[model samples]
Target chain A: GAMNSSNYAELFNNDIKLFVDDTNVYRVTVHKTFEGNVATKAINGCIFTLNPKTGHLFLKIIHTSVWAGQKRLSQLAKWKTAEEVSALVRSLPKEEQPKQIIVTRKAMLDPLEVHMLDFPNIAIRPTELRLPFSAAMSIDKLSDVVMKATEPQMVLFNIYDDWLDRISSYTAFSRLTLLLRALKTNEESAKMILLSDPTITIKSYHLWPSFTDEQWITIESQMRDLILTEYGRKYNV
Target chain B: MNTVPFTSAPIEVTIGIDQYSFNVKENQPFHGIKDIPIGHVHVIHFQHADNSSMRYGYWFDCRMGNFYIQYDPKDGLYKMMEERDGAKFENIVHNFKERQMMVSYPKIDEDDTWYNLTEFVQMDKIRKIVRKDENQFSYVDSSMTTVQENELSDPAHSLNYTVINFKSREAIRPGHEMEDFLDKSYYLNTVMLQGIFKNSSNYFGELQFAFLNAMFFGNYGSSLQWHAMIELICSSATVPKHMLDKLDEILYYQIKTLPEQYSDILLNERVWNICLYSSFQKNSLHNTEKIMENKYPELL
Candidate 1:
């Protein structure tokens, strides 16, 4: 098996979680489907936590398996109301001059900012949102003349915590002033970022970490064909 | 750590999960150079080399595009710094044993640098409580009852975070429909979490500090939201009863009553939860023959 010590149902069977949800607020949690057959079996999937304080990015989606399976006080996270267009029409319309004005507009997508995703299970703290935008960019005077000019062939880079967002932790704080202005100007753009890009891999993505194409056209291609069509409409085997 | 047939450009980089390779010439570093992007200024581990001053670091923007943001540094090395908890290696060896020392993420690189405090308090799983009336050595995890704040002040006043309080956030009311708040939040997180997979609850120094911060640094997706509440409590092996009061309003009014200075930055998030307990709790375990050798033709 090459491994043992495992839990959290062997690293999430359907994954997603983000929570620095206040101040720069971000409370994203998506889990959808299973209820039975390993992933620690129990099903009742579809969790979809809170994030939309305004506008919607697949806003609210609960019913945590009948509100945690059959108790159901349901309904918690929700937010998105941007429709008024002069209350809807007549000279822009509360229907004053009346005649015709339909002003409508409710289908707004792409509201939840932050992007960059590959099989990331979880590892947030983009340096606490990259230390207040790098203390407005003075980079603590300048890391010991860039660690004494990359003392002994310098090289610095880590921020690829995968499943990135919060706009890729401000692009890992703009690649930390682009690796300190390429070692503060020269050393040929600091060995030109050691031959550049391609590593991270949609993360080790726990055990079933897949889906995103808007979470598989919205919910992993209909959970397991709606649980095998509700057991062939209740057993026609 | 050997690669310098230096005919200019051997590049290859990705620090936090390790995949190093350096050879770049033009301005120079190549001569059998082993490594650079130092331990954590997050990195430029100065690839070419020079004057040195930036101690502890942080800056983050995006799309510099020249490639090489390469990372795997063996995936969070301590599983990626305990997924960045045990209060950041109990404050990086707790301010390096205090003598060239201090208090946490002061950007880092505090440099009096030394290790082996019982092998980094057991590779950062951290817990060694020995205090018989301030008999000297003092340390306690969970960032001391959770961020008391303004650690002596300055450095953006120990950062409280501003410019993100837009607070208009509305959803669960008489529903003005977006398919009735997406079918009632997908029917209260699917039958209220099948009443918590159905029900049932630890503290083993907080359960091996919550299973070593959820299997080594909470499976990488912005600190795996308390590792899906310990996988919805294994959940103390009995689940349901309105999913334990919706897991007690998400572990007591949203993560233990929110406000321990915004709850230790919820173990440091890069935010994104396209819902589903971040795929239960992402850290994609592998190697059952490296996952059937990626589609083995009827293995062996």
Candidate 2:
């Protein structure tokens, strides 16, 4: 059986292209908005703005819900609900805005349902984009994009799409490092955001078939460093 | 490197033969999360001898997250001497008093070995024997019989294979029943993995990729609950030995590693790469797609 009529749309269309120059840095921006299931309603009103070019990430969340309080939440979730999350998004100056913005959702949307559209250059559509959905797509499509880029490029990713897809974080982080290194990009530039709030700074490692405890210790230490240095500075914790 | 507010303390632990100290900060609380006392939050700083240093945050239930004492070689001599006569033998007891996560391990004992000991404790009320004192006063009951000479003379050890018992309300084969359990466990692990990975990040919809055609293709588009389970189970297991060994072989070599070159290939063109890779495998990628089409007509 061939792909049906519903499967016609290719994953991503490279929505907007900004011309790249030696001095100027540009990124492909894809806005992701989501609603959580019964237990995790706090993720609502959260928006993730990613610049694949610099791996610079901006996360915004409306604290209208109980998620404003971090009780009973995981450390990551607690970080997202911090007051600094809103401050980070609100603090961005006018010059940092992308030349264009594209909104891609998994399903059709109503105008009233859209939040945070007041931001400049943002546009919404009642359509879905077919992005990479598994380990294969991630390793192939993402790495391929990295290889051919004339200038540094970064693509925004929904946390669920990337991590939930069978690829281990250990493996993804390692592979991402290899690809970035091969492209001559800075190994420390890879960034990820959770719940459209707390940002995760990823550190690359040497490739291996299986990670040793020593390696895991190093990785865990790097994560802790990000939380203390990067995240601590943001929240003033 | 920038300095943080908290003072770093050193906690040393041993693994196998190596010993290391991790810089730690204890008793920190997240703002607005009330009733969380000390020990729930931990900040650890790890530094390599090469001078690479990093810090990370980890939070756990204070009660559940206690010191997980391991069998360190330094303690082995002392431990063996304590159990030399079997009079003071005491194995590690993982008491799951009350917790959401399953903390119990499978039980093991010989068929004829006494499973329980009835001990009578002489309570010295005048001396005020506390709860901790009960262990010292307790003694085995006379009903606890001694092992027979023939049992002690036996040379062969008891086989300790895991039993897959399927006690279903309805008729079900053990193989099929195990598969069903594996499918569900795989899916749950997938969801949990996503939840933990994404931790405050946006969850896009379910994963849809040609590589997973074999798992979900057979189930139709009935919401990817099972295949995710199976896929995760196989992925985490040793690559060559898991149930999906053939699939793993193809994915491991072709997809997991980088090739000599790169391509500006489109998404449609990329689908063919996976298909082509599975051509020589026992279960062809074409067959997987065919099964998916028959099962989930709308997906194709």
Candidate 3:
């Protein structure tokens, strides 16, 4: 009833080594390109770059695609001057940037620990009905590469390969939080104490991760295309 | 003392002799979404402690973004500062005669305007969280599960309980035309709504729940649509006469007709509804994946 051919390539199957650390000066080389459904937007991969000293983050999106208002994030690596990378940031408008677009329970609840410990009225967002699908790899597999290296925030990253697969893009989108938080979330106290900055936030929880609405549409559209193609390839169409 | 982030809400929930109580600090007000205090675009006209401009209680789909609102016991009501968007609201949804005020402001998407309840809407599709109205009433069920078309559409009024057959719909005792029992909606959805409301109470995104003796009154009775939704959620005897009869049909007709090992979910009602909502969703796909093929068989 099942065909072995439809299964996807494993995360480490290519042995391409997606992340590289550049000693004390900077970061290392990680996976740079993406193929298949999720990458159809030319969205090769994305990295979550953290500035431990200031507790700020740059959602470094490395893509082959470009636009006039195109804004990007860069890794604190030796190859490029961090200030020059900031130039790409400075030259853009807010709408073009991928700011923390998704609102989360984290933003509201995180600051309320002391304030609302004796209060009520905090509402919980409900679970959504998603297409039943599971992705080959989760965001953590990529997020953890740097997330785990708390001592050396060596550029946390993830590839589109981490999200795209047999389940279809919607499924991947639906199961994202599930897969990312499968184990205990790394964005907790253990994450907080290491940095000692209340301003510091994790990608998934407090600082919600997202692509701009327009950018998301491209990936969503491309993923849909990729899924439909995969569906067709599995059949006579 | 190491302050662990309330990463997972640290709120202690305890059940009361009559209702539910949450242990919290004093004087502190409500919570909201994002870095801002706009706790999801809200609606309607309701009074505050001093009877100032009513701070409307709103509900947006959990999908759009995560937001929260807490009950302030001192105020004896849930309160939040309304965004300037209220200035533009024009008593849109319920009536022109009512003249009750309403407004909304969205950053971008059509959904933003939609949840703000601007003009008319497909409230069913836009969001699933229960919409709270502006009233100081007792606890009301608030499971914000989006209403599927099945409730109002043709699927809602008809109840064939269509079992399986070789060609068309069939019967029991091996393919025989039995009585024509009609109960619209798989009985599954109504129960689904009921089960959903259970989790909605003082519910903060988890399967667990805490309750209050009172809640901000949602205008469930304001219209036939909201009426149908709330009654079904209340699981009250007020439910329509014809639709309620089908629970018996499950017993008389083997429900699935194809005869599976488990028929317990067919009628037990309470647990069934809770289990139905708690577990499978075409829907739950999350927790439903928990049950093995033997339990859910169909995987829907």
Best by TM-score: 3
Question: Among these predicted structures, which one has the highest DockQ?
Answer: 1
Q: CA lDDT of each candidate? A: 0.24, 0.26, 0.27
Give the least accurate 10-residue stretch of model 3 chain A, judged by summed lDDT.
A15-24
- How well docked is model 3, in DockQ terms? 0.00
Chain B TM-score of every predicted model: 0.19, 0.16, 0.23
Model 1 misplacement above 4 A: A1-107, A110-237, B1-192, B199-219, B222-246, B253-264, B267-300
Q: Look at candidate 3 and tell me the lDDT of residue A208.
A: 25
Q: In candidate 2, residue A41 scores what lDDT?
A: 38
Model with the higher TM-score, candidate 1 or 3 = 3
lDDT of 1 by residue, B87-187 (tens): 44334432434433211222124532111101111211221221222212112212222111332233321211111111112222223333323333332
Compute DockQ for each candidate against the true complex. Answer: 0.01, 0.01, 0.00
- First chain TM-score, candidate 3: 0.23
Docking class of 1: incorrect
User: DockQ score for model 2, please?
Assistant: 0.01
Off-target runs (Cα >4 Å) in candidate 2 are: A1-47, A59-90, A106-121, A125-127, A132-237, B1-300
| Clashes found in each candidate (C-alpha, N, C closer than 3 A) | 149, 15, 26
Tens-place lDDT per residue, model 2, B26-99, is 22211111122232111111222332322111112223322121122452210101113222211121122222
